[PDB]
Amino acid sequence: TLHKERRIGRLSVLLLLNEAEESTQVEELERDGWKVCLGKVGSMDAHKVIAAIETASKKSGVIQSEGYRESHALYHATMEALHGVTRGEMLLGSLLRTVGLRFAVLRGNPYESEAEGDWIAVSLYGTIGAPIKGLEHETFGVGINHI
Template identity: 70%
Template sequence: MALSKNRLIGRNAIMLLLSEDPNEQLQFLQQNKWRGCLGKVGSMEANKVVASIETAAKKNGIIQSDVYRESHALYHAIMEALHGVTRGQVQLGSVLRTVGLSFAVLRGNPYDHDQEGDWIAVALYGTIGAPVKGSEHETIGLGINHI
């Protein structure tokens, strides 16, 4: 049950998100049986961040919206990534913080054996800070969950 070194899902999600040419990176991952998508979201409300990522994942066929365990796995990966972005307190507008984030969602099997099944990773990168231009700083978060 070893992780395959060239198929680390978190690393690949971050590489996709930060890539100079994300479309080329996404095509490479898709050739290796991975499914992924990219997007952007900005908000003072965490629920809007979650909704934006879930919508992109469903629209791009990363998860099946009618299969609960897939939506559930994605939700937990998003929340884990948001914990990283918000330093453990998933609060935004209620404490006068706003985010401007790019995101990558990646699905695939990071293990050597197909029987291990798919996992999902959500990578977030952008800014967080007071809702005043120039009062933000960089942030990053990663969430990984099994499907």
């Protein structure tokens, strides 16, 4: 059962979709026990998007830098989020398109039961389009996994 006040997906998205000069939403989430990471990446190569998210998550301490387990969890969460962004073919430059994204990675337990342990949510928001400024529209993606 998901705890209404701990909906990791909704929280990650609301954080990513805000632009307040000083909302202190990060410190607030962290005070509540969440591990948070925010970043931005633009590219015509999906691997660069994946790497940016991984590197930011490890530097911010959202997931362990050592071992495979947590990296495995984050990779699959990122893949799931990329599905929403790419919608069918997980390709960018090869299909003549580019993305400009902001991302958020949140880690914690969104359930009422503490036995559910930690989960991770990767949320993406930005634009996708032809490699010409302006010829683009918005894109979103959210991936959730246990960790």
